[PDB]
Amino acid sequence: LKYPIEHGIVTNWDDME
Amino acid sequence: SPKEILNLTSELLQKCSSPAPGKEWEEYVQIRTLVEKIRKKQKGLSVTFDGKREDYFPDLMKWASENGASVEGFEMVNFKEEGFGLRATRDIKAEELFLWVPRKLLMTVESAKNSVLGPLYSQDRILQAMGNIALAFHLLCERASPNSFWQPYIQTLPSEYDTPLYFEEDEVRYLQSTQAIHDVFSQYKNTARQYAYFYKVIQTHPHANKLPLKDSFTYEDYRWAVSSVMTRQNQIPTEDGSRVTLALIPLWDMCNHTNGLITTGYNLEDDRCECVALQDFRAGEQIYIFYGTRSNAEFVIHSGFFFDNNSHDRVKIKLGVSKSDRLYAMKAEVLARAGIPTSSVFALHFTEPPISAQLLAFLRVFCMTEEELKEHLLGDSAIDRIFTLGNSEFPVSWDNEVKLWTFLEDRASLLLKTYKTTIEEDKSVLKNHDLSVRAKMAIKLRLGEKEILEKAVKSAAVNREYYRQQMEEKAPLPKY
Ligand SMILES: Nc1ncnc2c1ncn2[C@@H]1O[C@H](CSCC[C@H](N)C(=O)O)[C@@H](O)[C@H]1O
Question: Chain B closest CA to A11's CA: distance in Å?
Fold first, then answer.
């Protein structure tokens, strides 16, 4: 799979850092 | 009164912009108090729909169908366990390409850039840095636009989630003394800070004038928007294939999670998301995908559910070489040559082996004698020894192994002692109390942390004995 798609992939929500 | 809300959001912004404070629980309850006071003074979601969410699924299918998506072979069903999902209406064989969504249907950072949000986006430093927040405001703006291209998608989304942003105080309280609760704290604070910041920005920025949010933007709006994004968003390539971006993927994102492998990928040539069946699905069976190899802390906090028998579950463990160590410089140099920081947060895994190659390599260096360090620093074999540092088949010495597994056993045992309940009390709570879904998520999460630690204790104890046997019997050391 060249571009696997991760449902709900975790992202950084910390706008201060 | 708009003046009181402006007053309260300024206080919330101030409160949630101060640095991290054994004061984290007190701070959290302080922020909760402010958020709930604001929430109780507002009118919930700015935009609500007349129908039940299932009333809008036929519009979702027709819209997706007209834009080239697969709409045959499954139906939408409200399952008790997972909520709404897809059910097969015919037999679908493992590896069949049964579900595809062209890019035109997606909501992306790029479509956010080209929407009514565009002007505010080009000026606000947070929106430019954080595509997830941009996606959240994109969703809100389109939700409040009655002729949005994406209304069929937005009207079929949930109105609520089980992310910890929706937990009651007593439901979060179950998590006191755990690792996960500090990420619950951070999510709540980030979200309250972001709501207050953007509330003020939307009121003061000319670029926000045409946004529907300028006339109504509630804390409930923002909690819904970020929870929609964190429970459903995806990384996909840009159209040029040159970059990655964040996207909401209609229709396909209705699939619920089961154990397995990723079987959804982006097809750049035809510019669509493609999903092949993870397993056989008989007609009448729910269609599942595997979301990804996340921990149960991540499933709870970012996906709003606890997955039983999550074989990728893990806990964090912080470790570093101390500058008080007499061999600090040598150890730091060996770690650097192996590409490993002198301090970091590693993971302990539920599935054996409990530690990764990187953590094994760190622990070996952490427990090396000076002579062993010299052999990883000097001479014609040093680089070979760095190369095998993460390989359990090639120990540095039997003594090094005994030392590192002894260290790990004691540390995991020490960590177990920092929880306010035992594993057995947790099982007793789950057996004898009648609990909400959210409360059960919290207690299962705190039980899972301890069970991972307990499994790590047993595994390290077994490894210590294995390697002490090799040492006592003077086994020949494997050679690379
Ligand atoms: N295995 C599972 N157990 C419980 N809930 C699940 C689950 N897999 C997915 N979910 C739920 O589905 C959400 C991801 S989007 C999947 C569709 C969703 N059920 C809906 O009604 O729109 C998650 O936030 C969680 O609420």
Answer: 7
